[PDB]
Amino acid sequence: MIQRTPKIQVYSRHPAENGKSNFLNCYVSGFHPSDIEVDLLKNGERIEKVEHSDLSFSKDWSFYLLYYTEFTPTEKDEYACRVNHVTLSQPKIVKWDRDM
Amino acid sequence: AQDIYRASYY
Amino acid sequence: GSHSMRYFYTAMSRPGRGEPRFIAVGYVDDTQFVRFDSDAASPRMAPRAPWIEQEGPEYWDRETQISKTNTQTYRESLRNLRGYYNQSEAGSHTLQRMYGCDVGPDGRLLRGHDQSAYDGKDYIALNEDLSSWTAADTAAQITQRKWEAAREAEQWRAYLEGLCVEWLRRYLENGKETLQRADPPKTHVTHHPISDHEATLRCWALGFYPAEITLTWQRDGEDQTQDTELVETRPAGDRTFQKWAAVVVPSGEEQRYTCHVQHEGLPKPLTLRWEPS
């Protein structure tokens, strides 16, 4: 039956300013079915207390979810998003890039 | 506000 | 402009894992305002926009009640379709529904909507006349015959032409600042050298609402439409949206390139160039 691979975008709420507080977003969409798991990573280890938007879906019935957390960008800390879903052979990691 | 009738069974 | 109310329902069996789960979200335009999750601490209809909080205890009771029986009846509905399609009670299945109102800028009804999918596939859809259905297959024809024969069929339609429109107009008033003032994009262009002879120009649209937006790159007069990288419009996390468009340019020639931004919150289209500094 319908199985649709998730699209992933990692990005901040506001333009990344080293030292100033912000929000790290992992937006996953275009996936079916709705069972999916995702953690944000700081330097490679999961982040505590990550909230997420309530399950919704687009006009072609694919789901979407916004995973986020408060964070503070440093010049040095690597943040990322780790996503798994039945369509994936193994958990996919998307690195955060402040320019995208 | 939701429509109660859209709790009707398929 | 036009405005829309939508309820999105997801009902997912998880055999051997738990009871079927039921989630409802409601939207006015691109703003989510209510949420219900049958797995919650104690399942309640819960607010998610400022303006919905004006609603008294009477309101949150009806919506919680409707969603509590939604939770009961959609489990029944998954069993029917399990039966309609002759399916094992072991596999997991998904039922999705959308429904609601459209009203014009003067607040007159335009359209009602009611569509459902089952395991991602279109299943049944209400027609424009709001009083007849289109079925994807013979399973959905069973549902169609039940829905069309119901003593309640007129009251189904009366919801879309009546109560649904009344609440939409109300919500649009309770949050008229929120919901009736488009926020234009804060716009930037940024420069990203690729080699010594190529740079990436990235056009940013940020903080805008509603989500609909157009970002075009123009090399001189015409549109670089086949050389433009566009990401999907995406939520900022604060009820606004972001989007960017990017093009690779000859390192010397950045000024040949303009970004064109259209959004409901912009008087006229914007045009940006890369301003080095």
UniProtKB/TrEMBL annotation, chain B:
- Source domain of life: Eukaryota
Which residues lie in coiled coils? Answer: none
Q: Enumerate the subcellular locations listed in this protein's record, separating them with semicolons.
A: Cell membrane
In the record, the note on similarity to other proteins reads: Belongs to the protein kinase superfamily. Tyr protein kinase family. Insulin receptor subfamily.
The annotated subunit structure for this chain is: Homodimer; homodimerizes following heparin- and ligand-binding. Interacts with CBL, IRS1, PIK3R1 and PLCG1. Interacts with FRS2 and SHC1. Interacts with PTN and MDK.
The protein's name is Tyrosine-protein kinase receptor
Q: What organism is listed for this UniProt entry?
A: Homo sapiens (Human)
Boundaries of the shown chain within the full protein:
1274 to 1283 of 1620
